[PDB]
Amino acid sequence: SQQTRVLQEKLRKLKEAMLCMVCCEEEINSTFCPCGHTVCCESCAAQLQSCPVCRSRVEHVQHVYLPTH
Amino acid sequence: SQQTRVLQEKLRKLKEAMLCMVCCEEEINSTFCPCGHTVCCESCAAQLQSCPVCRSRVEHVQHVYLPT
Ligand SMILES: c1cc(-c2ccc3c(c2)OCO3)n[nH]1
Ligand SMILES: [Zn+2]
Ligand SMILES: [Zn+2]
Ligand SMILES: [Zn+2]
Ligand SMILES: [Zn+2]
Numbered sequence: 001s002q003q004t005r006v007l008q009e010k011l012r013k014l015k016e017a018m019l020c021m022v023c024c025e026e027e028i029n030s031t032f033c034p035c036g037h038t039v040c041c042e043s044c045a046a047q048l049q050s051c052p053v054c055r056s057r058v059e060h061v062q063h064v065y066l067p068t069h
Numbered sequence: 070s071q072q073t074r075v076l077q078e079k080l081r082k083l084k085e086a087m088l089c090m091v092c093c094e095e096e097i098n099s100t101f102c103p104c105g106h107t108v109c110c111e112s113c114a115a116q117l118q119s120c121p122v123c124r125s126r127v128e129h130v131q132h133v134y135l136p137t
Contacts, residue, residue: 007076014083017137031100031133038107038133053134062131064100064107065122067086 018068020044021052027069031062038064087137089113090121100131107133 020026026041032048035056040048045061089095095110101117104125109117114130 001070001073004070004073004076007073007080011076011080011083014080014137021136028136031131033131036132036134038135062100062102063105064133065105066107067090067097068083 029064029066029069031064032056032058033060033062091117098133098135100133101125101127102129102131 018027020028020041021039022044023041026043028038028040030040030042030045031038032040032045032051035051035054035058037051037053039053042061042063045058048058050056051058087096089097089110090108091113092110095112097107097109099109099111099114100107101109101114101120104120104123104127106120106122108122111130111132114127118127119125120127
């Protein structure tokens with residue numbers, strides 16, 4: 001039905017929000033510290049000196065184990 | 070249709086996976102450091118000396134700003 005199409009769209013958008021903002025291909029699994037923005041995969045987070053969202057200095061990257069992984 | 074029910078169940082499970090594993094009421098927004106398990110809201114994470122997934126000591130809690 002049309003309701004099935006609406007639910008498919010909600011699921012697709014939620015899943016796309018879980019992907020890295022830089023490569024758009026891998027799941028997010030890294031946090032920039034101390035700001036806390038958790039928007040990248042490990043590879044993309046590895047070479048950034050400043051947060052791509054807020055511009056804060058990245059002191060280190062924390063790996064995150066999320067249930068949605 | 071039956072697919073509407075199947076999709077509603079998939080959405081419900083994905084939403085429940087984003088909720089705190091302890092209180093089941095608030096969204097996950099905190100990481101236990103250094104282990105990295107990100108399974109609690111800030112109120113439950115503040116009250117745990119040990120990670121509820123791996124039992125490692127919690128040195129500190131990092132707030133996470135997630136896209137959703
Ligand atoms: C990559 C990103 C996520 C994610 C994103 C938002 C969330 C969340 C998990 O649980 C609470 O709200 N999972 N894998
Ligand atoms: Zn990436
Ligand atoms: Zn940031
Ligand atoms: Zn909680
Ligand atoms: Zn842990």
